[PDB]
C-alpha cells in the first residue's frame, strides 16, 4: 500500500519524530511495518528541474510514478569524453558498440592523427549503444515511463527526477557538478499509478508550509480530483490496525456562539 502525506519524509528521522502520530494517525503498537521512503532527493530534484521546464510538464510527469518499482539513473560523461574514458581501461566496454570501433579502442597506439578513427568517432552516436538515453531536451513526461518500465536508465543530463543519480565514470570525467518496503509504505508525492495508492485527507492545501509540496498538491487537486483516494486519519489508523523545539503540533477549533439568556438553548453564530 502507498499513502501520501504533506511533509518531507526520510527513512531516518521521520520515525524518530513520530510523523503519523504528528498527523493524528494512531499507530501505537510500533509493529514497524510502515516503511518509509526518503524524499529529500526528489524534492531537491524538483527544485532543480523547476529551473528548466514548465511546472505543468514537471508535475504532470511526476504524478504518474510508481514509487514501489525500484529504479535508478546513471548519467554519462559527454560524447567527447566518454571515448576517453573508454580508451583507458578498455575492459569496461559494452558489447553493443562496433567490432570496428572496439578494435580501434582497445589498441595501445596513441591515435594522434585520426584518418578513419575521426570518421568512426564522428559517425558514432550514443543512441544505438545505450537504449533509453533520455536526452538533454527530452520533454520530461517520458522519463517517468522509462523509469517505471526498466530499472537502470541511461541519461546525459542533470535535470532528471524520480530516483537517485549515480555516476558512471569517476569524478574527473565531468563538467556539470534494494530499499526495504514492507507493504504499508508512506511518503509524499502521490501517485495515480496504481490502485491501492492513497492520499491523506485532513489539512487544507491553504495551510501547507513547504510551498513546493503545496504547489504540487494544488496541481494534483486541480486536476485528477475525481480519481484520488482521500482517507481520514481514522481510516489510516484502521488500515494499520536530539528532540527539536520550535515545531508545535497545531489544530483548529470549531466552536459556535450560543445564548442561554432566557433559559432556552439557541445557536446564533
Amino acid at each position: 500500500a502507498y499513502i501520501a502525506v504533506p511533509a518531507v519524509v526520510d527513512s531516518r528521522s521521520s520515525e524518530a519524530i513520530g510523523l503519523l502520530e504528528s498527523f493524528g494517525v494512531d499507530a501505537g503498537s510500533d509493529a514497524n511495518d510502515v516503511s518509509y521512503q526518503d524524499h529529500d532527493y526528489v524534492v531537491d530534484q524538483l527544485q532543480y528541474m523547476l529551473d528548466g521546464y514548465e511546472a505543468g510538464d514537471v508535475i504532470d510527469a511526476l504524478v504518474y510514478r510508481n514509487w514501489l518499482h525500484h529504479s535508478v539513473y546513471c548519467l554519462l560523461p559527454p560524447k567527447s569524453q566518454l571515448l576517453e574514458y573508454w580508451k583507458s581501461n578498455p575492459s569496461v566496454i559494452p558489447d553493443n558498440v562496433d567490432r570496428r570501433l572496439r578494435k580501434r579502442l582497445m589498441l595501445k597506439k596513441d591515435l594522434r592523427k585520426d584518418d578513419e578513427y575521426n570518421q568512426l568517432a564522428r559517425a558514432f552516436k550514443i543512441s544505438d549503444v545505450y537504449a533509453p538515453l533520455i536526452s538533454s531536451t527530452t520533454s520530461p513526461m517520458t522519463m517517468i515511463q522509462n523509469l517505471n518500465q526498466g530499472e537502470i536508465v541511461y541519461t546525459t543530463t542533470d535535470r532528471v527526477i524520480g530516483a537517485r543519480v549515480l555516476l558512471y565514470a569517476p569524478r574527473k570525467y565531468y563538467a556539470s557538478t534494494r530499499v526495504p518496503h514492507s507493504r504499508f509504505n508512506v511518503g509524499t508525492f502521490p501517485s495515480i499509478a496504481t490502485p491501492k495508492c492513497s492520499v491523506m485527507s485532513g489539512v487544507d492545501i491553504e495551510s501547507i508550509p513547504n510551498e513546493f509540496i503545496k504547489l504540487f498538491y494544488q496541481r494534483v487537486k486541480s486536476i485528477h480530483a475525481n480519481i484520488l483516494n482521500d482517507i481520514s486519519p481514522q481510516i489510516v489508523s484502521d488500515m494499520i490496525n536530539h528532540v527539536d523545539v520550535y515545531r508545535v503540533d497545531v489544530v483548529n477549533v470549531l466552536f459556535e456562539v450560543v445564548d442561554v439568556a432566557d433559559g432556552l438553548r439557541s445557536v446564533s453564530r
Binding site: 558489447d95 562496433d98 567490432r99 570518421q119 559517425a123
Partner: protein
C-alpha cells in the same frame, strides 16, 4: 532385509532402482527422517493410506455411573490348591450406560488424531457442539441451535475419518477354561494378555451367581467364540488372514470393510508397473520388476481418468492469475530440458562466420557489424529458448509472447538498416511462441515498416496500417487483407504480397505425439484424447545422419524463405533512397552467410525435442494442460478458459472464474526475441553422440526420482474430498444437489456463503489433519460460493462455440461412510448425547418414579390436545390492573391468562428470556404454567439422586432458564432416580423438566450384579444388540445395522505387506 522387497523372505525405503551398466543404486526415503545418508527424497505431499490397527475395532464403550457392591454367593473359581479371581465382562454397577469413545482399546502404529470423546452423561458435553462455528458466543457452557446440525455433521465426519484403519493378525492362544474349550482366543499386543480376555469375550466367565450378567451368559450360546475361519496360505505357520469372534461394533467394521474394498480395488502388480515404465521410456531403455508369487501384497495405485481430471481442475484453479505460482514450474522444466538436452549453444559459430566479413575504410555503416552489435554474441545465456520449450506444454495456462522492446522503435521504417535487422531477428524468433496471433504480428511488423511505400486495404475509417504489432493480440483484430491473400494487389505491394504468401504457405504445421501410458497410469488430459500431446512444430523420426541443409524441415525452410525475402527487399534499392553508398553487395553477402549456417537446432527441434518432452511429461507434478494449436483458422482460435462450479440444469448467478479475465488465453509471458534467435542460429551436437547411450544415461537418474506413485494417491484424496464436500454442503444449505435427506429434525439455518465457507474450511482442515497433509487440498474451491455441485472446465473458440468437459465423479467411500453413519445416527441418536422431541417445563410433585427420559402419556400434550394454546412470534404481554390477571397473546389473537398448557418455539424464549423469566418464574414454580418448548434436538446431562430422600429441581431448572441467551443454549439438566434392587422408602420429589418422546436408549443395564430390580427403572442386558449369541438361527454374517448397531460382531483380521517400488533398468542397444 533386501530380499523382502521382492517378497521371498529368509530367517523403510520407498523406491529402489538398480542400473545394469554401472554400479550406482538410487533409493528414495521420505523427507521426514533425520538421516538421509546420500539418498534421494520424496518432496510430494503423499497421504498416509495404509494404517494398521491391532487392538479392538469398537467405538462404543460401557461406562459405569453409580457404583455399588452386593453380597455374592460364589466368590472365586477353584483349582486343586489355587483360587482364580472372578472378572465380570461388564461393569458391575447400579446404573451403567453406553457412551462413545472412538479407539479406547486400539493399538495404532500411526494415528489419525481425529477423536470423538464422550464424557459420561453426568458430566458436560457441550464442547463437541460448540467447537465448530460458535466463535463469538459468551456463556462457555453453551451452543447455538442454529448450528446443531453443522456440529453433528462435522462430528460424524470426525467419526468416519477416525475409523479408517486396517486390522492386524497379532496372535492367538489356546484356552482350556472349563467354559471355553479349545477356542483359540486372540492375544492383544502388550504386557498382559490375560487382562483383556474378560472384556473381549463376554461368554468366557460362566454362570456362578444369580445376576443379570449371569443369566445372560446362561442365555448365550457357546461355540461362536474365538477363531471362526482362517486362510489356507501361511508364511511359516501363521495364517495371512483370519476370521474371529470378538466384541466390536457393526458400524466400525462396516466402515473398515468399505475402506478395505476401496484399497483392494486400488492395488497394482509390478508387471503392469514395468510395462508402464517401458512405455513411458519409449523404447530408449527397458525396465523389469522381478518378484516372487504372493497374494497378500498390496500397493494402492490404480486409479481412474476422472479422478486425474478432477485433480487437474483443482490444480488449474490454484493459480488464479498469480505469476508467482507459475514461474518456478516453467523455470524448472527449462533447467531440466537443458540438463538432459544433448544440444549445446555457442555464438562462436556466428562470430567465426562473420569474422571474414569486414567493410572498407571510407565507410560509415556496415551490415555485418550492425548484426553482430545487434545479436550480441558475447552474451551466453539461453533461458527464453528453454522457457518457450516449456510453454509448449502449458499453452492452456500461460501464453508466451515476445517483449515489445524487441519490436522496431516508434514503428520503425524500411529505410533503416537497424530496423531491417530487428525485423530479421523478430521474424526468425516468432514461430516458436505459443501465441495464436504470431503470424499476424509477423505480417504487421513488416507492414508498419512498409508504411509510405506499399499500401493495403483497411476495413474501417478508424485504424491505419501504421498500427503497431504489439496491439494485434486477439483474433478480432486480424485484417481481411491478411486472411484473404487476393485482396493485396501485387502491382502496389509486391514484397508485402510475397510476405503474406510465404506466411500462408511455409508456416510450421502443428502435430501430435504419444506419451506415457493411459492403460495403467490414466491421464489428466481434458480437451485432448488422453494419449496425445499437442505441438506447434511438426516432428519426424530421429536420426543424426540427416543433412544440415534440409529444406523439408519446417524451421530450415522458414529461415531460407525469410532470408530470401529480405534479399528480395534489398535487391533493387527502391525502398532505400538516400543511401549514397551501394550496400546491396555486402547486404546480400551477409544474408547469404546467414542463410547458409550450420545450426543443428532446427534438426534438434524437429527430431529430438518432442521425444524428450514426451519422456519428461508424465513424470511431472503438474501434468500438462494443453489447448489446441490452430495454424491460421481464425474461427477456431481459443480465447477464454473458464471453470464452472455450479450444476448443468440449475440457473445460477454468473460467477466467472478469474482465469477468464485475461486478454489472451492464459497469463501473458514476455520472452526475448534475441536469445531465441541466437539459440536458433547457433547450436551443435557433441561429436560422438550415440542416442541409445546418451538417452539411457539421461533417463535413468530421472526415472529414479519419479513421483507418480505418490501423485496418484494425492489425486485419490482430492477426488474423495470433493465428493465429500459436495455432500456435506448440500446437506447443510439449500441447493439442487440431491443427497437422500437423512437428518433434518436437527434444527439448522439456511446457510449463506460465509457460513458455508467456514463449515467447508473446517471440513478441509479436518481431512488434511486426518490424512496428514500440509500442501493444498480444496482451498481453491473456497474462494467464492463454496455451495457447488460438480466441477467442469471449458473454453470457447472465436466463433462462439464452447467445448464443455464434465468429469463424471465416481462413487466415494468416505462420503458413503458418512451417509451410512448419518443413517444409523437417525436411530442411534441417544448414544452421541442428543435427544429428540422436545421438553415440557412444569411442576410435578409426587412420590412416583418414572425416569423422566421416559414419561407416562398423562403428562404430555401435542398440538391436537384440546384446551392447549399455541403461540407464535407475536405474543405480547399486558399487565392486569387493579388485581386482574396479566394476559399473554395467543397466535389466534386472543389474550390468555398465565394458566394451563402452552406451546412455544425455542426462538420465542431465546429472543427476550430476560423479560420472559421475570414474568414467568413464579407462575412456573408455584402456579400452573406447564410449557412445552419445541426444540427438535438438544444436548442433555443427568443429575442422579437418592429417591429415598427429599430432593428438588428448581435450582437446576432456574439456572438453565437464566443461562439461556439469544446466541446459545446450555445442556438441559435432567433429574432421574437411582434404581435399587432392595426395596426402599419413598420420599417426595419435585420434577420440573421431562422429555416428550423416548430417549432412554443409551442405558445399558440397571443393578448388574442383582437378581432383579424392584425400585427404579428396569432394563436387563439388551438381547437385541447381541444377535449372534442369543439368536440360534442367525447366521454369523447377519447384522441389523440400520436399525440398531450390534456389538460383538464378526471381524476379519489381516496381515499384508508393502514392498518398495523396485525395478532393474536395462539399456537398449
Amino acid at each position: 532385509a533386501h530380499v523382502a522387497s521382492h517378497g521371498l523372505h529368509g530367517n523403510r525405503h520407498i523406491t529402489e532402482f538398480i542400473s545394469s551398466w554401472q554400479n550406482h543404486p538410487i533409493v528414495q526415503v521420505s523427507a521426514d527422517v533425520e538421516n538421509r545418508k546420500t539418498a534421494q527424497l520424496l518432496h510430494a505431499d503423499t497421504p498416509r493410506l495404509v494404517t494398521w490397527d491391532a487392538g479392538l475395532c469398537t467405538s462404543f464403550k460401557i461406562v459405569p455411573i453409580v457404583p455399588a457392591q452386593v453380597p455374592q454367593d460364589v466368590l472365586a473359581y477353584t483349582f486343586f490348591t489355587s483360587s482364580y479371581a472372578i472378572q465380570s465382562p461388564f461393569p458391575e454397577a447400579a446404573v451403567s450406560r453406553i457412551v462413545v469413545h472412538t479407539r479406547w482399546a486400539s493399538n495404532v502404529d500411526f494415528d489419525r488424531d481425529s477423536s470423538v470423546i464422550m464424557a459420561p452423561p453426568t458430566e458436560n458435553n457441550i464442547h463437541l457442539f460448540k467447537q465448530l462455528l460458535n466463535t463469538e458466543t459468551l456463556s462457555v457452557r453453551g451452543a447455538n441451535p442454529l448450528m446443531f446440525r453443522a456440529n453433528v455433521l462435522h462430528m460424524l465426519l470426525e467419526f468416519v475419518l477416525d475409523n479408517l484403519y486396517l486390522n492386524r493378525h497379532t496372535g492367538f492362544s489356546q484356552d482350556h477354561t472349563p467354559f471355553t474349550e479349545g477356542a483359540n482366543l486372540r492375544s492383544l499386543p502388550g504386557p498382559d494378555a490375560e487382562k483383556w480376555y474378560s472384556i473381549m469375550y463376554p461368554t468366557r466367565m460362566g454362570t456362578p451367581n444369580v445376576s443379570k450378567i449371569c443369566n445372560f451368559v446362561a442365555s448365550c450360546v457357546r461355540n461362536r467364540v474365538g477363531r471362526f475361519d482362517r486362510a489356507q496360505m501361511m508364511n511359516g505357520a501363521m495364517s495371512e488372514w483370519v476370521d474371529v469372534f470378538e466384541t466390536s461394533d457393526a458400524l466400525t467394521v462396516s466402515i473398515r470393510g468399505r475402506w478395505m474394498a476401496r484399497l483392494a480395488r486400488m492395488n497394482i502388480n509390478p508387471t503392469e508397473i514395468e510395462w508402464a515404465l517401458t512405455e513411458c521410456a519409449q523404447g530408449y531403455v527397458t525396465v523389469t520388476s522381478p518378484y516372487a508369487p504372493s497374494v497378500n501384497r498390496l500397493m494402492p495405485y490404480r486409479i481412474s481418468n476422472a479422478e486425474r481430471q478432477i485433480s487437474q481442475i483443482i490444480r488449474v484453479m490454484n493459480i488464479g492469475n498469480n505469476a508467482t505460482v507459475i514461474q518456478p514450474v516453467l523455470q524448472d522444466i527449462s533447467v531440466l530440458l537443458q540438463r538432459i538436452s544433448p544440444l549445446q549453444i555457442d555464438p562462436t559459430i556466428i562470430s567465426n562466420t562473420m569474422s571474414t566479413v569486414s567493410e572498407s575504410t571510407t565507410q560509415t555503416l556496415s551490415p555485418a557489424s550492425s548484426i553482430l552489435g545487434k545479436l550480441r554474441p558475447s552474451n551466453s545465456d539461453f533461458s527464453s529458448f528453454r522457457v518457450a520449450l516449456a510453454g509448449w506444454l502449458y499453452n492452456g495456462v500461460v501464453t508466451t509472447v515476445i517483449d515489445d522492446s524487441s519490436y522496431p522503435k516508434d514503428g520503425g521504417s524500411v529505410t533503416s538498416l537497424e530496423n531491417l535487422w530487428d525485423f530479421f531477428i523478430l521474424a526468425l524468433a516468432l514461430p516458436l511462441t505459443t501465441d495464436p496471433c504470431a503470424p499476424v504480428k509477423a505480417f504487421m511488423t513488416l507492414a508498419n515498416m512498409m508504411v509510405g511505400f506499399e499500401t493495403i486495404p483497411m476495413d474501417n475509417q478508424i485504424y491505419t496500417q501504421s498500427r503497431r504489432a504489439s496491439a494485434f493480440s486477439t483474433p478480432h483484430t486480424w485484417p481481411r487483407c491478411f486472411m484473404n491473400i487476393q485482396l493485396i494487389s501485387p502491382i502496389d505491394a509486391p514484397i508485402l504480397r510475397q510476405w503474406a504468401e510465404i506466411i500462408h504457405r511455409y508456416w510450421p504445421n502443428p502435430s501430435q505425439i504419444r506419451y506415457g501410458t493411459p492403460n495403467v497410469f490414466g491421464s489428466a488430459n481434458l480437451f485432448t484424447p488422453p494419449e496425445v500431446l499437442l505441438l506447434p512444430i511438426d516432428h519426424q523420426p530421429a536420426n543424426v545422419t540427416t543433412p544440415t541443409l534440409d529444406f523439408t524441415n519446417e524451421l530450415t525452410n522458414w529461415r531460407a524463405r525469410v532470408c530470401e525475402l529480405m534479399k528480395n527487399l534489398v535487391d533493387n534499392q527502391r525502398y532505400q533512397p538516400g543511401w549514397t553508398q551501394s550496400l546491396v553487395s555486402s547486404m546480400r553477402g551477409t544474408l547469404g552467410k546467414l542463410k547458409l549456417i550450420k545450426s543443428m537446432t532446427p534438426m534438434y527441434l524437429q527430431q529430438l525435442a518432442p521425444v524428450e518432452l514426451a519422456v519428461i511429461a508424465p513424470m511431472l507434478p503438474f501434468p500438462p494442460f494443453q489447448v489446441p494449436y490452430v495454424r491460421l483458422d481464425r474461427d477456431r482460435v481459443p480465447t477464454m478458459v473458464g471453470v464452472t462450479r455450479q450444476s448443468r440444469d440449475t440457473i445460477t448467478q454468473p460467477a466467472l472464474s478469474l482465469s477468464t479475465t485475461n486478454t489472451t488465453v492464459g497469463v501473458p509471458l514476455a520472452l526475448d526475441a534475441r536469445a531465441i534467435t541466437v539459440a536458433l542460429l547457433s547450436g551443435k551436437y557433441p561429436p560422438d553422440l550415440v542416442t541409445n547411450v546418451w538417452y539411457a544415461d539421461a533417463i535413468y537418474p530421472m526415472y529414479a526420482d519419479t513421483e507418480v506413485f505418490s501423485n496418484l494417491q494425492r489425486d485419490v484424496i482430492t477426488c474423495e474430498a470433493v465428493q465429500t464436500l459436495v455432500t456435506l454442503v448440500a446437506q447443510i444449505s439449500e441447493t439442487q444437489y440431491p443427497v437422500d435427506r437423512y437428518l433434518d429434525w436437527i434444527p439448522s439455518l439456511r446457510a449463506s456463503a460465509a457460513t458455508a465457507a467456514t463449515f467447508a474450511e473446517w471440513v478441509n482442515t479436518s481431512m488434511k489433519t486426518a490424512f496428514d497433509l500440509s500442501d493444498m487440498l480444496l482451498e481453491p474451491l473456497l474462494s467464492g460460493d463454496p455451495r457447488m455441485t460438480q466441477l467442469a472446465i471449458q473454453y470457447q473458440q472465436y466463433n462462439g462455440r464452447t467445448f464443455n468437459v464434465i468429469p463424471e465423479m465416481p462413487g466415494s467411500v468416505i462420503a458413503d461412510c458418512v451417509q451410512l453413519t448419518a443413517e444409523v445416527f437417525n436411530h442411534e441418536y441417544n448414544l452421541f448425547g442428543i435427544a429428540r422431541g422436545d421438553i415440557i417445563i412444569g411442576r410435578v410433585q409426587s412420590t412416583h418414579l418414572w425416569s423422566p427420559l421416559a414419561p407416562p402419556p398423562d403428562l404430555v400434550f401435542d398440538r391436537d390436545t384440546p384446551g392447549v394454546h399455541i403461540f407464535g412470534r407475536d405474543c405480547r404481554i399486558s399487565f392486569g390492573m387493579n388485581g386482574a390477571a396479566p394476559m399473554i397473546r395467543d397466535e389466534t389473537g386472543m389474550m390468555v391468562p398465565f394458566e394451563g398448557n402452552w406451546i412455544f418455539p425455542l426462538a420465542l424464549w431465546q429472543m427476550n428470556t430476560r423479560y420472559f423469566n421475570q414474568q414467568f418464574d413464579a407462575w412456573i414454580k408455584t402456579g400452573e404454567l406447564r410449557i412445552r418448548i419445541e426444540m427438535g434436538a438438544y444436548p442433555y446431562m443427568l443429575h442422579y439422586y437418592d429417591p429415598r430422600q427429599y430432593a428438588n429441581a428448581w435450582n437446576l431448572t432456574s439456572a438453565w432458564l437464566e443461562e439461556i441467551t439469544p446466541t446459545s443454549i446450555p445442556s438441559v439438566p435432567f433429574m432421574v432416580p437411582i434404581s435399587s434392587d432392595h426395596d426402599i422408602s419413598s420420599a417426595p420429589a419435585v420434577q420440573y423438566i421431562i422429555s416428550t418422546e423416548y430417549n432412554d436408549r443409551s442405558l445399558f443395564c440397571t443393578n448388574s450384579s442383582s437378581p432383579q430390580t424392584i425400585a427404579g427403572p428396569d432394563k436387563h442386558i439388551p438381547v437385541e444388540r447381541y444377535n449372534i449369541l442369543t439368536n440360534p438361527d442367525a447366521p454369523p454374517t447377519q447384522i441389523q445395522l440400520p436399525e440398531v448397531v450390534d456389538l460383538y460382531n464378526v471381524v476379519t483380521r489381516y496381515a499384508y505387506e508393502t514392498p518398495p517400488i523396485t525395478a532393474v533398468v536395462m539399456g537398449v542397444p
